[PDB]
Amino acid sequence: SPHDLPDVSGLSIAVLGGTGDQGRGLARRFAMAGHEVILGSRSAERAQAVAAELGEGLPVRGMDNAGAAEAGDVVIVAVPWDGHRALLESLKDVLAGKIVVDCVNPLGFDKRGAYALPVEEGSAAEQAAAILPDSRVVAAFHHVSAVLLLDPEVEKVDLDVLVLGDDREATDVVRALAARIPGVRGVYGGRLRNAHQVEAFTANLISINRRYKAHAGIRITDI
Amino acid sequence: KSSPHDLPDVSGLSIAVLGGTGDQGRGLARRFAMAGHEVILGSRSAERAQAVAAELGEGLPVRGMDNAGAAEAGDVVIVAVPWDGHRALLESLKDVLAGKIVVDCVNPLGFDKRGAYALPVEEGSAAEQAAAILPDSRVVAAFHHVSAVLLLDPEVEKVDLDVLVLGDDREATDVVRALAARIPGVRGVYGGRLRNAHQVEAFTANLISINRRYKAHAGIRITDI
Ligand SMILES: NC(=O)c1ccc[n+]([C@@H]2O[C@H](COP(=O)([O-])OP(=O)(O)OC[C@H]3O[C@@H](n4cnc5c(N)ncnc54)[C@H](OP(=O)(O)O)[C@@H]3O)[C@@H](O)[C@H]2O)c1
Numbered sequence: 001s002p003h004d005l006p007d008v009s010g011l012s013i014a015v016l017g018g019t020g021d022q023g024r025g026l027a028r029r030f031a032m033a034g035h036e037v038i039l040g041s042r043s044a045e046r047a048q049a050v051a052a053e054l055g056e057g058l059p060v061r062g063m064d065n066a067g068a069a070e071a072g073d074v075v076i077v078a079v080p081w082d083g084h085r086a087l088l089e090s091l092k093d094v095l096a097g098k099i100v101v102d103c104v105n106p107l108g109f110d111k112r113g114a115y116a117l118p119v120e121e122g123s124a125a126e127q128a129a130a131i132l133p134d135s136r137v138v139a140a141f142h143h144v145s146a147v148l149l150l151d152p153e154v155e156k157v158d159l160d161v162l163v164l165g166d167d168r169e170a171t172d173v174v175r176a177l178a179a180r181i182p183g184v185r186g187v188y189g190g191r192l193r194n195a196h197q198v199e200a201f202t203a204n205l206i207s208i209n210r211r212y213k214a215h216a217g218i219r220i221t222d223i
Numbered sequence: 224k225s226s227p228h229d230l231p232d233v234s235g236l237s238i239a240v241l242g243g244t245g246d247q248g249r250g251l252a253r254r255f256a257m258a259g260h261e262v263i264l265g266s267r268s269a270e271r272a273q274a275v276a277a278e279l280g281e282g283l284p285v286r287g288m289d290n291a292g293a294a295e296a297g298d299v300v301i302v303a304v305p306w307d308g309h310r311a312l313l314e315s316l317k318d319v320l321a322g323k324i325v326v327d328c329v330n331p332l333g334f335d336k337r338g339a340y341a342l343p344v345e346e347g348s349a350a351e352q353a354a355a356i357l358p359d360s361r362v363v364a365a366f367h368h369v370s371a372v373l374l375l376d377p378e379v380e381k382v383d384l385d386v387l388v389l390g391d392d393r394e395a396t397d398v399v400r401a402l403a404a405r406i407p408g409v410r411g412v413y414g415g416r417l418r419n420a421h422q423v424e425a426f427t428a429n430l431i432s433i434n435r436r437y438k439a440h441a442g443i444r445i446t447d448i
C-alpha cells in the first residue's frame with residue numbers, strides 16, 4: 001500500500017529557527033508524541049529558554065542552530081525566508097547524510113494580502129536541495145497553523161500535510177513524522193520540482209483565512 | 224451579516240464553453256446542463272460542436288457553435304482550450320468577450336518520464352495572461368482541479384471537491400462560486416486574488432502525481448471554513 005509507513009519512534013528531531021511560532025508549534029507536538037526535540041537558534045540561551053517554557057516534562061531542549069543540526073536525526077528548517085540560504089550554506093557539512101525538511105514559505109505581504117516571491121532555484125525546497133546535495137531534502141508542513149499547534153486546547157487538526165521529495169524512503173519517514181500530529185495524514189505530494197506551488201498555496205490559505213475567518217487547512221480526497 | 228458562503232442566484236445564466244468538445248468542456252457542460260443551464264459548446268468547427276452537443280444532449284439543454292458564436296451567446300464564458308491555443312484564441316475574441324465574466328480553467332503543464340510539472344508563464348499564470356489579453360473582461364480562474372472523467376461518469380452522483388475560485392472582482396467570483404455549486408458535492412471556495420492563480424494551476428501537477436501514486440482521482444477540500 002502507498003499508505004504504509006515506517007516506524008519513526010526514537011527519531012530525534014532538530015528544528016532550526018525553532019524559537020518562533022512554527023518551530024515551537026512543531027516542537028511541541030513532536031515532543032508530546034515522545035520524540036526528543038532540539039530547538040535551534042542563533043543564540044543557544046534563547047533556544048534553551050524557549051524550550052524550558054514549551055511544556056513541563058516534554059523532552060525538548062535548546063542549542064544554537066549548528067548544535068541542533070548536529071544533534072537531530074531529522075532536521076526541520078523553520079527560519080524565515082530571509083535567512084534560509086545563509087543558514088543552510090553554513091550548515092552544509094553538519095547536514096550531510098541527513099533528511100532535511102524545509103517548511104519555509106517565501107511570501108510577500110502588501111495592503112492586498114499575501115503573494116508568492118519568485119525564487120531562482122524554483123522554490124525554497126529546491127534552493128535547499130541545490131545547497132545540500134549530500135542531504136535528502138523533503139518539503140513538508142507549509143500549511144500548518146502554528147497557532148493551532150501551540151494551543152493546549154487543540155486536540156486534533158484537520159489537515160493533510162503534503163510531503164514532497166525525490167527519495168521514497170525520506171518522504172515516507174516525513175509522512176510518518178507528520179502523522180504524530182493528531183488529525184494529520186502525511187500525503188505524498190510529488191517530486192521536489194512541484195514544491196513551489198505548495199509553498200505558494202500558503203498565500204491562498206491566508207486569503208481564505210481572511211475571507212472565511214478561519215484557520216484553514218486542506219484535505220486530499222479520494223485517497 | 225452576509226456569510227462569505229452565501230451565493231448569488233445564477234439560475235438565469237447561460238454558459239458558453241470554448242474548446243468545449245474535449246473532456247473538460249463536455250464534463251462541465253454535462254453537469255451544468257443537468258442542473259438546468261443552457262450550455263453552448265464552442266469549437267473551431269460549428270459542425271463538430273453541434274455533433275458533440277447532439278451526443279451530450281439527450282434530455283439536456285446543450286447546443287453547439289463556433290467559438291466566436293458561443294462566446295457571443297454565453298452570459299458567462301469558460302475557456303477550456305489547451306495551453307498551446309490559449310493566447311491566440313483569446314486575442315481573436317477580445318471584443319466579443321468585452322464586458323463578460325470569463326472563466327479560465329487552463330492548466331499550463333509539462334510531462335516527462337518523471338511525471339507532471341508546471342510550465343513558466345510570462346504574465347504569471349494562464350489566468351493572468353487572460354486578464355492581460357482581456358482588460359475589458361472580468362477574468363476568474365476556476366475549475367483547474369476537476370476530474371473531467373468523473374463529471375462525465377453516469378455512475379458518479381457527486382464529486383468530493385472544493386473548486387477554488389480566484390479573481391480581483393468580488394461579484395464575478397461570487398457568480399462563479401455559485402456556478403461551481405451546481406455540480407453535486409462541490410463548494411465554490413474563494414481562493415484569493417488573480418495574482419495567486421499560478422499556484423492553483425500548477426497544483427494540478429501535484430494532483431496528477433497523487434493520482435499516479437495512490438491510483439486515484441484526487442480532489443481537495445478546504446477545512447475549517
Ligand atoms: N507560523 C506559521 O503558522 C507557519 C506555518 C508554516 C510554515 N511556516 C514557516 O516557518 C518559518 C518560520 O515561521 P515563524 O512563524 O516561526 O517565523 P519567525 O518567528 O519570524 O522565525 C522563526 C525564528 O527564526 C530565527 N531567525 C530569524 N531570522 C533569522 C535569520 N535571518 N537567520 C537565522 N535564523 C533566524 C529566529 O530565531 P532566533 O532569533 O532564536 O535565531 C525566529 O524566532 C517561516 O519560513 C514560515 O514561512 C510558518
Ligand SMILES: NC(=O)c1ccc[n+]([C@@H]2O[C@H](COP(=O)([O-])OP(=O)(O)OC[C@H]3O[C@@H](n4cnc5c(N)ncnc54)[C@H](OP(=O)(O)O)[C@@H]3O)[C@@H](O)[C@H]2O)c1
Nearest residue numbers: 242244245246247266267303304305308329330367370371
Ligand atoms: N481533462 C481534465 O480533467 C481537466 C481538468 C481541469 C482542467 N483541464 C484543462 O482544460 C483544458 C481542456 O482540457 P481537455 O482535457 O478538454 O483538452 P483537449 O481535449 O486537449 O482540448 C479541448 C478542445 O480544445 C480545442 N483545441 C485544441 N487545440 C486548440 C487550439 N490550438 N486552438 C483552439 N482550440 C483548440 C479542441 O476543440 P476543437 O478541435 O473542436 O476546436 C479540443 O477538443 C486544458 O487547458 C486542461 O488543462 C482539464
